[PDB]
Design a protein around this ligand. Sequence first.
Ligand code: MG
Ligand code: MG
Ligand code: MG
Ligand code: MG
Ligand code: MG
Ligand code: MG
Ligand code: MG
Ligand code: MG
Ligand code: MG
Ligand code: MG
Lengths: 138, 103, 363, 66, 110
Amino acid sequence: SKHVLEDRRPKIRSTCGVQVGTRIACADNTGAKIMQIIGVKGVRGRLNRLPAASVGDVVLCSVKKGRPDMRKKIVLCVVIRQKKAWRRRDGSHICFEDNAAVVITNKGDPKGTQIAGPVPREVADIWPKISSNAPAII
Amino acid sequence: NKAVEMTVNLGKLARKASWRYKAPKCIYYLKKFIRSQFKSENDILIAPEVNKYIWRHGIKNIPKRMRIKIERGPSNKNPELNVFRVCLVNVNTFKGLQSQSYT
Amino acid sequence: SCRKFEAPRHGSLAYMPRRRARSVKQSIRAFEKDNPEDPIHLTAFYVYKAGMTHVVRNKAMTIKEVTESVTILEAPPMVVFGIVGYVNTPQGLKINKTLLSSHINESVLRRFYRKFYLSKKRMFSSGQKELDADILVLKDSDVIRVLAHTQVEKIKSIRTKKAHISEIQVNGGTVNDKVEWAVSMLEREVKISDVFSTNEFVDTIGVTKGKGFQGVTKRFGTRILPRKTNKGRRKVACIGAWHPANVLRTVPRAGQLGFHRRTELNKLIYLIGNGKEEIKTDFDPTLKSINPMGGFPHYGLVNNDFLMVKGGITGPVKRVLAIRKNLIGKKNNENIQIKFIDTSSKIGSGRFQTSEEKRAFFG
Amino acid sequence: VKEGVCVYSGYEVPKGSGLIRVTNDTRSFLFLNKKVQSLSNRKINPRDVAWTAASRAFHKKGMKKV
Amino acid sequence: TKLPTIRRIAASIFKCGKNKIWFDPGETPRLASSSTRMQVRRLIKDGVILRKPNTVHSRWRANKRAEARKKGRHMGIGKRKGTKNARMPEKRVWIKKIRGQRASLKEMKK
RNA sequence: GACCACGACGCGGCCGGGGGCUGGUGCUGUGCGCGGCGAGCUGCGAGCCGCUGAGGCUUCCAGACCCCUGCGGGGUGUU
RNA sequence: ACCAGGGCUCCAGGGCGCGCACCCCACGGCCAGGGCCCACGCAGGUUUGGGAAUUCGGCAAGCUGGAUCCGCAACCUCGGGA
Ligand SMILES: [Mg+2]
Ligand SMILES: [Mg+2]
Ligand SMILES: [Mg+2]
Ligand SMILES: [Mg+2]
Ligand SMILES: [Mg+2]
Ligand SMILES: [Mg+2]
Ligand SMILES: [Mg+2]
Ligand SMILES: [Mg+2]
Ligand SMILES: [Mg+2]
Ligand SMILES: [Mg+2]
């Protein structure tokens, strides 16, 4: 509620690889390096279940290390990479090397101007503004 | 009074045995196999060379296959009652061996 | 007092008491609504679960290729050998007249015996002068069902010659014409293609895989107690309040799991084919059987007509399975275009589609 | 309809099987199974693994020509 | 009753353990009749009672490892579990060093 | 054995079954053995190579092959 | 009580290894139902991804582990810390 996403996007159901408490890399050049997941946007919540996210999902994160103006701040980000292999819609399985997210604004546009590493087609389908800042879409 | 010479798969006979006690239960599943194969309740005399073959690599590592020979005959204790004598057949390979019977 | 944090109930009360099913063959408890302007057709069939594979199909929305698990239900044709007529009584439905054929073979009269090998086979010794009198009272019925049995010997992997008998409702128009069709179809085989077609939704009725006596964690999915728990962790901890001074039936207790009757709705038929003929799709130009390499695991090979159904099917393989038309009128707007059928070996994880593809790899 | 060729073993991967590992160099590698993945994580050369197509090409026992 | 009596009698004759004693399995009624050491000595002389040999503890593998170690085969960094001083005493090295230097210094002096 | 704590349930009881064996299908990763390299050393020698995607295993599937193989007891209905 | 308890003293061969540690062997001495393995146990392995979010609390489990070489801070009672 303090960090609204003004236009909410569709979600792609896949195996959730990150959770609340997962330390993830920050892929863009916002100055954040490692963020820890505080919450997942959209999660209704079940008893004892930690809210878990997959790629393309909007995630709240506290910057655990990075630039001094960026650290210790709750931020909105979109999960773009995931170490857990997930089944795609065509039925193949894809695994990324790290757990990475990209800081976005409240309107859904990325804060950074470039992204280190690739994104999959899932992030490209939901977030065309994010995947434009990435080098390759896989 | 035939003599059946056949290959038994001690792995398959003792699948439901514990891995820890594969050898003594293999004797149990073999004698249970002979009774179901020849529908009889005569005793099965397991020759000590058969038992030495089964315990060859200890209690867990039983050999997979084993060629035996079953001799129906009268009991040396009481000749009124027939008995099965399982004797061991030393074979170099099991590839292609067919079960046979003769007198 | 109130529980501190609310959660949904573990497991549905709609399926409690979880008892064993009374039989392995399940009768159709409800057929679809008989419409007199519809043509005459049967409404159910009895198939046998062979196994699963996955197909690849083009999912038009642009075209996106998707793969989906299917399951293959072998369906030898069922022989119609009797007619049952019903009347609408104020107590419900009542048997108006049962008309059997003069011929009942060794398969279907194996069902009437517990030990058939020791039997004298004298069931159904059974006149044709009373046929027209029995057809006439059958025309006074409200509901017409045929007595059909399965041909289980045609599968031959199931070591069962004993047939499964069931009533299948004849839906169509003008009960006169229902029994005139039914006396025509006596001692005749009914194909699976006559009853169902592709991309139509059906309900499957069967008995699930039995799991035996199971604890509450498998039977209901209750949370495993923490590591410190004395007297066991795979339990429900509090089985009730002090008052009411009994245990409620809504509390998960350990018991029988599986071997329950289940009806699953809206299972889409992807393909109706025959196990002998080799399938070819528009995109995969290889003639191959529906049987994967090495046969279906714990089933064998399909030699009869088969039913390819999207998803999973209740129960283990070789178990009989009732399949009826859906009781609501639900049609598939999509047209299933199967691009590819995986006939790879399901033993292990096979990478070849045919044995010729394997023999070409190794020389 | 296949997924592609495995990058390690050289085997043809069926559609629905295999894993596409993307390695942050924007490079995607298709591995056939978990056996192949475990060899690649251990940095084992596919010419050392005797059943892969890389070793049978290396040892020249792979084929005869037309 | 009878045959464990013979087994300790034959053990005290052989001065071995009772488990190292083999009876002739065909000859048990002669064994069960005998009761004195004079008879059990006769059964040893007749070969009815034998002393089994001890169980094989061959030193082939130990001697093959020893001469390999003398070449230095299993002496690497990963085959050491004691310290340098524990494995070769720093005091024993000095005593071997200083006594050799003291002996030859005297032998120069004579 | 598709059921199963035990009962129960499902199939079958010589038009049958069980086991072998063979083939299929997988898994593992190239067997024992024999014969060429091999750091060096004064014949030894880890390892490698070839025979050898070999050998082992396959509880799943198939068989038109091989061998074995009984038919006892209890009770209840009808006339 | 033929009790998994307790009870003074003496004598251990080979290998590994620092070691009468562990482990294997020797000597010497031994071996006390049947069938099936549901649930829940007791004991022990392994669990993708996450990594203390569990919990009163890292309880329990796990990580580290021998040796050789290098490097080693604040502090300090100058000995340590190490
Ligand atoms: Mg909680
Ligand atoms: Mg406690
Ligand atoms: Mg499988
Ligand atoms: Mg000193
Ligand atoms: Mg010692
Ligand atoms: Mg884990
Ligand atoms: Mg904590
Ligand atoms: Mg808490
Ligand atoms: Mg906490
Ligand atoms: Mg602790």
